[PDB]
Every structure is written in C-alpha cells, then in structure tokens.
Amino acid sequence: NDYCQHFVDTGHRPQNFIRDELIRLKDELIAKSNTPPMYLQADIEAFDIRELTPKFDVILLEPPLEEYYRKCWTWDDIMKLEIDEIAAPRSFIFLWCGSGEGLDLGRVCLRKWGYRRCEDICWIKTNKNNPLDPKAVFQRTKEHCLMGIKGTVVDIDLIITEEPEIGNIEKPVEIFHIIEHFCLGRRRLHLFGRDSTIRPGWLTVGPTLTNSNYNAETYASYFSAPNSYLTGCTEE
Amino acid sequence: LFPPQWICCDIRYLDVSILGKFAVVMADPPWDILPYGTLTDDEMRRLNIPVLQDDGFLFLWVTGRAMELGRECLNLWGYERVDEIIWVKTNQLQRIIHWLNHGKEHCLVGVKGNPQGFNQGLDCDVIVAEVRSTSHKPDEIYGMIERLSPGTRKIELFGRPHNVQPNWITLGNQLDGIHLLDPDVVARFKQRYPDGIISK
Ligand SMILES: CC1(C)CCN(Cc2ccc3c(NC[C@]4(O)CCCN(c5cc(NCc6ccccc6)ncn5)C4)cccc3c2)CC1
C-alpha cells in the first residue's frame, strides 16, 4: 500500500496511518528530583550569557526561526551565541532546527560549540484534521531537533503529533520527556522558552517571559553537595 | 531507452563519463560507520559524481556519522541540500519498529544547477512503508522520484538487483553482469571498454 501515492491522491500525509512494562517509576523519580522551576526574562540578543550559572548539564535551544511564521532569529544570530561558555565539560544540547537550512546550519552550530551530533530526533506532523519554500523539492511535514554530546560520555527518535494551528510555534512537550528520561543531570536550561513552557526541573530564559524568579545563588544552592552529581533519575 | 539497465562494476573505477547526464542521481553508499564492500571517506569524496549531472537532483541515503559525511560529499560534489526525506519504518500492522532506538532512515536531497520542469511539491518528505529484507530501501522512493521528474534519465549507485527500475541505470558490484540498451551508452561503453572488462 503506497502512502506517498495516497498523499498525492488525497492529501493525507503518510504519517496519518501510523498506529499507536511501565516506565513510570522513572517518571516519579524525575518529578521528586526536580528543582523548582526557575525562569528569567532576558533579551538574549543583548544579554551576556555568562551571567547564567552554574554550567549546564542539558541545554534546550529553541530560537524563533523565520520559517515558523508563514523578533525572528536567523542562523547568523544563533551561531553567534556563546553556548560553549555556559555548558558543562560533559553536557548535552537539543537544538530545534526546523526543516530548512537549519538542518545544516544547526550542525555547524553544534560543532562550533564543541558537540558532536549523536541523535537526530524528528517531530513528524500529521494532518488528520486538515487534508512552500522556493528551494523546497517536497512538502515539508516535519521538524528536526538535533542532540549533541560533548565531553566523555527506551525512547524512539520520533515524535508524532498533529500539526499545530498556524502561528502556533509551540514544540511538542514530548521532547521534554525524551530529554528527562536520558537522566543526564539536573542543571537544565531552555533558551528561548516562554511562560507556556516553564516546567519543574528547568531554568527557562527568553525574551517574552512576563515574570522572573532567577537568582544565581538560589539556583546554585539546588546543586550544592551532596546533590552535585545526581542524574535526576535518582531518589534525593 | 526506457527498460531497466545495469552495470556490475566497482563504482570506484568505472569511467562514469560514458553514461551521460541524468535528471536524478540516487546513492545508497556502503559508508564506513568494514563489512563488506565499504568505501573509505576519501573514496566516497573522490567518486566522480560531478560528471553525472548538469541540472537536477541527488538523493543520498545517510545514517550515523554519514549524516555529516554525506553532507560533506554532497557539498563537495557541487550540490546544495534543499530537502531531507525521512522513511518511518513499519511492520505489516503499520506500527513503528545509541541513546535512542531508531525508527527512521534518512535520505538527503540535493540540488545542482537550475532544474526546470520538475514537479516540486507533489510528495511530502515523510515515507511510511513496510520494511523488507535487511538494507533494501522502500520502493516508494522511485514513485516519488518519478512523479517529481517523469520520463527523465536516472542513475542509482550501489544498487542491488532488486533495485533495477525502468528509466534507471543501476551500478553495483552484486548486479549480474552488464545490461545496456540506450544506444548512446552502448556506443561509449564499447569504445571505452572494447574487451568488456573494468579495471582500476
Ligand atoms: C536502509 C537503507 C535505505 C538501505 C541500506 N543502506 C545501507 C546499505 C547500502 C547498500 C547496500 C548494498 N549495496 C550493494 C553493494 O554491491 C554491496 C557491496 C559494496 N557495493 C559496491 C561497492 C563498490 N566499490 C567498493 C568495493 C568493491 C569491492 C571490494 C571492496 C570495496 N562498487 C559497487 N558497489 C554495493 C548491499 C548490502 C547492504 C547495503 C546497505 C542504508 C539505507
């Protein structure tokens, strides 16, 4: 059965026809391990990234690409971010790259900041409820989130959800589950988050946040000894 | 000449200038990521892809670190990557099969020159199709490529016998012999290889 031909026929994207012991104790540990949510309004263009301490175990980077709209950030602006200055020597990055040139420029960013890509995570958008870039050859129905590692050392690499309403730039919350199940550590930073993405276990920094509670020394106290090397998948 | 054609050969050593120009090139390389006909990164970089097209498209299957290396070759060979196809691998019940389990294979899409008359935008960049033998890409890729550029000449590198298609020329060292029907190609092959052997 040809779903590419079906899509040509009917406009139902092939991903519409993808169907479907506990993995829930893990979740409960993540939740109890989680630091309070912390968050800071900051215009990242003008903001010295080094003020964000301590060094992070996980960085989730979600710059507002122009393609999401059909202030925007270009890959020119994103590349100039000094991500290496706030990443721990052994740490991870998750970069939402969209679907166009970001797939290449995001790999350049990752290398610029000292990571190598270990996973390519695809957010596949179904269109069950509503059956073009000039350089595009095909209709683009997915977005990529690249996973990078730097330093020495149960989930799939697909997220399938329905394509959001136009002008909805939100990424699936499923990405947070994938990240948190890795148990990479507890200093987690979400660059260009919003009020709507604030989440326990995470520091959120973005220009549209309406309130802040970030305090550098308060944040660092969450990881004082004996909590210094926890994975976030472990009892207090 | 429209029916399937193929050449058993070592793609490293074949004089691909004899084959002419192609609207679409597809490659599924044995990347070093070795078992068993692996090409080294330099061997890949040195493949004479640039002679095969003037205007058109390249389809390049990548996995692991070849996601980066294939981006390198494609750029070195003179292409811009303008799309990336994802094949979601399913079983017969339409269910999905290092840090994450992999449920997809990637295929880079590159453009060279100023391809005109192609039906961009007919298909979308996600394939859902049942997995068959090990390796072995889904046949949906050929329908996608046919709808995109119908009737035109196409060449596939590192295909296996099951990969041979109408309008395509297939190269690989596990094809059975040489089978050429296009007259311009038969001519250039006989001149370049009067004894039918294909040495370094
Ligand atoms: C899942 C996917 C969609 C499909 C699988 N795909 C990976 C993949 C790709 C191709 C495969 C394949 N191709 C047939 C083959 O003949 C195999 C031997 C090498 N080869 C050469 C090599 C060559 N010179 C190099 C040389 C010659 C002699 C000795 C040493 C080196 N010249 C012409 N052909 C191609 C067969 C089996 C599995 C494959 C898997 C991933 C994406």
Identify the CA nearest to B84 among candidates A97, A63, A7: A97
- Asked if residues A236 and A31 have their Cβ atoms less than 8 Å apart, the reply is no
Q: B124 to chain A nearest CA, in Å?
A: 4
Inter-chain touch A158–B94, beta carbons under 8 Å: no
Q: A122 to chain B nearest CA, in Å?
A: 9
Which of B72, B79, B84, B108 best tests the A interface by mutation, with the highest count of A CBs <10 A?
B84
SS3 assignment, position B75: helix
Give A86's Cβ-side CA count (13 Å radius). 22
Q: Does A175 reach chain B within 8 Å, measured CB to CB?
A: no
Inter-chain touch B128–A117, beta carbons under 8 Å: no
Identify the CA nearest to B128 among candidates A128, A11, A3: A3
Residue in B closest to A101 by C-alpha = B82
**Which amino acid is present at A100?**
G
Round to whole Å and give the CA distance between A195 and A212: 10
Domain enclosing residue A188, as ranges: 22-221
Inter-chain touch B124–A118, beta carbons under 8 Å: no
Angle at A81 between CA B62 and CA B107, to 5 degrees: 10
Residue with CA at minimum distance from ligand 1 atom 36: B160
Residue with tokens 């988050």: A193
Gap between the terminal Cα atoms of chain B: 28
Listing DSSP states for A70-90 in one string gives ---B-HHHHHTS-GGGTEEEE
* CATH code (residue A183): 3.40.50
Q: Distance from the CA of B121 to the center of ligand 1, in angstroms?
A: 30
Inter-chain touch A14–B67, beta carbons under 8 Å: no
Which H or E element spans position A190?
strand A188-191
Residue with tokens 């190598």: A116
Which of A15, A109, A137 best tests the B interface by mutation, with the highest count of B CBs <10 A?
A137
Is residue A155 a part of any domain in this protein? yes
Round to whole Å and give the CA distance between A105 and A113: 12
Round to whole Å and give the CA distance between A157 and B170: 32
Residue with CA at minimum distance from ligand 1 atom 22: B37
Pocket test for ligand 1, best of B12, B14, B28 (most atoms within 8 A of CB): B28
Phi, psi of A15 (to 5 degrees): -70, -15
Q: Which pair of tokens denotes residue B86?
A: 């994802």
DSSP structural state of residue A233? S
Is residue A169 a part of any domain in this protein? yes
Round to whole Å and give the CA distance between A34 and A236: 10
Q: Alpha carbon B63 to chain centroid distance?
A: 14
Is residue B108 packed enough to be buried (19+ CB in 10 Å), middle (13-18) or exposed (0-12)? buried
Is residue A43 a part of any domain in this protein? yes
Report the domain count for chain A: 1
Q: What is the CA radius of gyration of chain B?
A: 17
Is residue A17 a part of any domain in this protein? no
The set of residues, in sequence order, having a beta carbon less than 8 Å from that of A30 and lying 6+ positions away, is A180, A181, A201, A232, A233
Residues of A with Cβ-Cβ distance to B86 under 8 angstroms: 122, 124, 142
Question: Domain coordinates of chain B in residue numbers?
Answer: 1-200
Round to whole Å and give the CA distance between A121 and B72: 21
Which CA distances in Å does A202 have to A189, A198, B81? 6, 7, 35
The set of residues, in sequence order, having a beta carbon less than 8 Å from that of A236 and lying 6+ positions away, is A32, A33, A227
Q: Is A225 left (phi over 0), alpha (psi -120 to 50) or beta?
A: beta
Which CA distances in Å does A156 have to A62, A94, A102, A178, B46? 21, 15, 22, 8, 35
Which H or E element spans position A7?
helix A3-10
Residue with CA at minimum distance from ligand 1 atom 30: B37
Within 10 angstroms of residue A73's Cβ, the number of other Cβ atoms is 18
Angle at A43 between CA A57 and CA A143, to 5 degrees: 60
Q: Which pair of tokens denotes residue B68?
A: 């980066």
Torsion sign (Cα): A126, A127, A131, A136 = negative
Round to whole Å and give the CA distance between B169 and B101: 35
SS3 assignment, position A23: coil
Q: Which pair of tokens denotes residue A6?
A: 């079906």
The set of residues, in sequence order, having a beta carbon less than 8 Å from that of A73 and lying 6+ positions away, is A63, A64, A65, A66, A192
Is residue A201 a part of any domain in this protein? yes
Round to whole Å and give the CA distance between B83 and B91: 26
Inter-chain touch A138–B86, beta carbons under 8 Å: no
- Asked if residues B38 and B52 have their Cβ atoms less than 8 Å apart, the reply is no
- Asked if residues B149 and B22 have their Cβ atoms less than 8 Å apart, the reply is no
Q: Distance from the CA of B158 to the center of ligand 1, in angstroms?
A: 5
Tell me which method was used to determine the 3D structure. X-ray
Inter-chain touch A18–B128, beta carbons under 8 Å: yes
Q: Distance from the CA of B59 to the center of ligand 1, in angstroms?
A: 15
Q: B129 to chain A nearest CA, in Å?
A: 7
Round to whole Å and give the CA distance between B192 and B156: 21
